[PDB]
Structure 1
Amino acid sequence: IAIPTNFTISVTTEILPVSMTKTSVDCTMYICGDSTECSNLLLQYGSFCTQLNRALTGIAVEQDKNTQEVFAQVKQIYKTPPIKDFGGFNFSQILPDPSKPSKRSPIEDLLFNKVTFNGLTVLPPLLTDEMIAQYTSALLAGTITSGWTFGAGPALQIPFPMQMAYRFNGIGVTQNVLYENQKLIANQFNSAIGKIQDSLSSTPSALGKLQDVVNQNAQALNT
């Protein structure tokens, strides 16, 4: 039998879309733009226009619904303490930056930077980017200050090393390992976060799962 004598902690990335760009089309304008004769001829075809408009409106409302479903899961807004003291851990890469005009993390800023009239229009999303960022920051503050309790009831506070010890206990490893390798584990966690920050860019094949959505929408409109 073989038994490991040392371990590593690592961090990975997972990208997956939630919504696409909603749109709408004016059937009569697109087909017979400003022509009474053409409209009169089109009147002899039934309810194709109404069917298409209903379908498009359903699509748009579904897009808003699924964005809301993904993000708005908690109502109360939490905030991180002004003093950053988590026993050696460093969340500066993921927490929002107040100095920025948009209160979003450096990683979010890099992700935002990396991604680039015949009756057809484009409608704006109901939920805005600042609101989405506020949701994300609230979730992050809740999970860093409470654990899993804020998703099952009233948020209760626990020290972060103790939360980490419980999560070690959740995979069959006793808590003394954390309690006597705290410094090393914190160093490895911070280094891994920095590595992700570096490696997120410098590769033009990571945000393809979103670039393809943008390209497909643009190509459909173009054709």
Structure 2
Amino acid sequence: NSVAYSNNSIAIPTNFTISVTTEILPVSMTKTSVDCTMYICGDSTECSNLLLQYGSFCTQLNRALTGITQNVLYENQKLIANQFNSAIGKIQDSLSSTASALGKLQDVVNQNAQALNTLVKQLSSNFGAISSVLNDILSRLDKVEAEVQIDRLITGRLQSLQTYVTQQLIRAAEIRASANLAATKMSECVLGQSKRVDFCGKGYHLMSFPQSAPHGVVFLHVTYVPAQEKNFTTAPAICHDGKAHFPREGVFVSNGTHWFVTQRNFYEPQIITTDNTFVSGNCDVVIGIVNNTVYDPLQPELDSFKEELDKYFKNHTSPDVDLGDISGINQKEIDRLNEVAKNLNESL
């Protein structure tokens, strides 16, 4: 017998004061369209120009927000002439061979001088080519290492603008429920008179007059409130000898000695009769349970970042460049010939 038969002091209106309410409801929302450049980047031109490559995403967000003795002296004469004539013929061999040698040395040394001027013109091409191609690799890699940091901050400002768009759609879906509240609260109280307590102004409803506002409706409700009220002890129902008895359109207001079915909204007692009450059987309480679970969503739970990275990420490190190490590739006779050019006159 838990609560259905407990008696507790309940305020019941003793008397009334006449009153009026001004109740304001928003029924529409002005279309807060957003320029996506000025929101995310603002004045800053390098990120602005990057925004064009994010596509027409801005428009897409605005679809949402815009909706919603003479012999031996002579034989010595033969001898010395035969020694000389044979010597000079050996001088011509000695000298012709030296000319044929020194003329092959002067050939090959000038062919080497040609080869080194060929090498310098080709290597001037290589250090000039590498100058231009490697300056471009440096100049463009500096651009790409800048842009990847500005894209980072654009992408975190995208989420700030997506929180803006979500909170601006959330509010517009509350506004469209407040326009349904303005529909029922117009109907039941401008076309009718409500029997509900505090719907259509504080207290109990008499009459109403709607007036517009720029995005709203405002109600003038004329109502009566309890100027004074008294706590009577009560029960919702009473179980006499195993039968439960309970009101019809009232409560059991409790006098010191008797039960009366007062109207809930006023102290005006009337006697228990089979026309003021309903009746039951066996004196039992049915117990009901209601649990209004507003929806608790499947929230997007994720692995640790290491697992969702390592699934596809490649930690490729290019090797330390090594190339060819070219540091590993490592007068006396003219004095005499000048001396004997003089000292041969000592044998003239």
Q: Normalized per residue, which structure has more strand?
A: 2
Q: Normalized per residue, which structure has more helix?
A: 1
Quick check: which has more Rg, 1 or 2?
Answer: 2
Same fold (TM over 0.5): no
TM-score by length of 1: 0.31
